[PDB]
Amino acid sequence: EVQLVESGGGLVQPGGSLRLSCAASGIIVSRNYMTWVRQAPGKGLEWVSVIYSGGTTYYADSVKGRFTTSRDDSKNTLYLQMNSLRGDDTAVYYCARDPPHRRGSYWGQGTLVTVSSASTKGPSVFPLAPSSKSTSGGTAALGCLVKDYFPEPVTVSWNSGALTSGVHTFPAVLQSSGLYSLSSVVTVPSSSLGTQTYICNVNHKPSNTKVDKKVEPK
Amino acid sequence: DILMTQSPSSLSASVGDRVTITCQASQDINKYLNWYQQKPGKAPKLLIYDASNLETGVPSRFSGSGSGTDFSFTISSLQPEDVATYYCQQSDNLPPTFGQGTNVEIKRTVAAPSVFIFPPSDEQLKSGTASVVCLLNNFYPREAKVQWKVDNALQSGNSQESVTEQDSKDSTYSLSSTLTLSKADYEKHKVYACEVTHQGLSLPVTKSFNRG
Secondary structure: OOOOEEEEEOEEOOOOOOOEEEEEEEEOOOOOOOOEEOOOOOOOOOEEEEEEEOOOEOOOOOOOOEEEEEEEOOOOEEEEEOOOHHHHHEEEEEEEEEEOOOOEEOOOOOOOEEEOOOEEEEOEEEEOOOOOOOOOOOEEEEEEEEEEOOOOOEEEOOOOOOOOOOOOOOOOEOOOOOEEEEEEEEEEEEEOEOOOOOEEEEEEEOOOOOEEOOOOOO | OOOEEOOOEEEEEOOOOOEEEEEEEEEOOOOEEEEEOOOOOOOEEEEOOOOEEEOOOOOOOOOEEEEEEEEEEEOOOOOOHHOOOEEEOOOOOEEEEEEOEEEEEEOOOOOOOOEEEEEOOOHHOOOOEEEEEEEEEEEEEOEEEEEEEEEEEEOOOEEEEEEOOOOOOOOOOEEEEEEEEHHHHHHOOOOEEEEEOOOOOOOOOOEEEOOO
C-alpha cells in the first residue's frame, strides 16, 4: 500500500556521479519533508540531506557542495544527485518520511551505492561435498563456496528455493585481495544422499548465474 | 552538531526479561528523540517518536521515556523476534544525529556446535588455490574458538571467519572458518584439521581430513 522505493544505486568510480530516485506511493512528496539517510557496510546511520515542503534543502557537511536533493511533484519522486563521489560515500541509501510529532513513519528498503576503482569480477562457485564419513540416520553438511567476486552482493538459493530449512548463507568476508568471498551451507539427512538432488544457485551483479550440483566425491 | 551517546552497545537477556537502553544528548533536545529498530538485512523501522510516543502497530512491550538530555528505551518482556540493533536519534536540531547503536541478543541455553570440515575441491586446485572450510553449525553462545592445525602445525594469518546472525527459530549462531593457501602448500602436507573450543563442549573437538 504505502511505501517508498529507492533506485539508482550501483558501483561507480571515484569522482563519478549518480542519481538516486525515491518513488512515493501513498505519500505526497510535496506535502511532507523527505530525508536521505545512509549506512556504511556494518556501521551506523548518518543523516545525509533533507528537503522541506517549502523547497528548503539542507545537507550534511561531508556531502555539502557535492550532493543535491530535489523532487518532481508531478512524478511524486524524490531525487538525490551525487557528484564528485568518494570512497567514504559507499553505503546503503534510504529515503524516509518521519512525520513531525505524528504517526506514520516510512523508510524505503534502500539502494546500495559502491564507489571504488575496482572492476566487477564474477565469482567462482566451488563445492563443499558431504563427508564420506557421514553415517546413515544422522545429519550431513554440504555447501558451496562463492569465491573472488566484487562488488557486493551475491544471492544464493538451494534447489531453486525448494530447500530453505537448515540453510546458512554466511555474510561476505573481504579478502586480502580486495575481492569478497562467501559460503552457503545446508544440513540434510545422511540418508537421501544420492537419492535427492542438492543444487545451489548463485547470482551476482555481473551476469553470473551458477547452478551447481553437490555430489559425494567418488 | 549534537552528540548522541547510546549505551550499552550490546546486551543479552532471556525471553520475557526487562531490557533498557540509555541515550544521553550533548544538548537539550526537549522530547525530540526517536528510537529505531533495525533487524538484520532490513531497513530501520521507527518504533518510538518524540521520546515516548509509540508508532502504529508497535507492541506494548516497547516503551520510551525522558526529556532534556537523558532518555530511556525499554522492552518489558523481551521476545525472540526483538533481536535487532536499536538506534536513538534526535530530530529537531539540524543535522539529525544518531547513537552508536545497541545490539540486542536473546539469551537461551548453551548449544554445542556441530562441526564439519571441508577439503578443497578438485576444480579449485586447478585455480592454483586450496580453500579448506570449517563449519560450526547452530550453537549458542557466539563466543567460540576455531584453530587451524595442518600436519599438527598451528596456523595464523591465513584464515578468515564469518558468523551468521542470531536465528529466528533457534536463537543460535553459525560460524565458518576458511583457510586459504596455495596449491603448493596444500600438496606439501597431509593432515588437515580444525580444532573448535566452545562452552558446551567438554574438551576441544577436532575434525580432520587427509588428502585421499
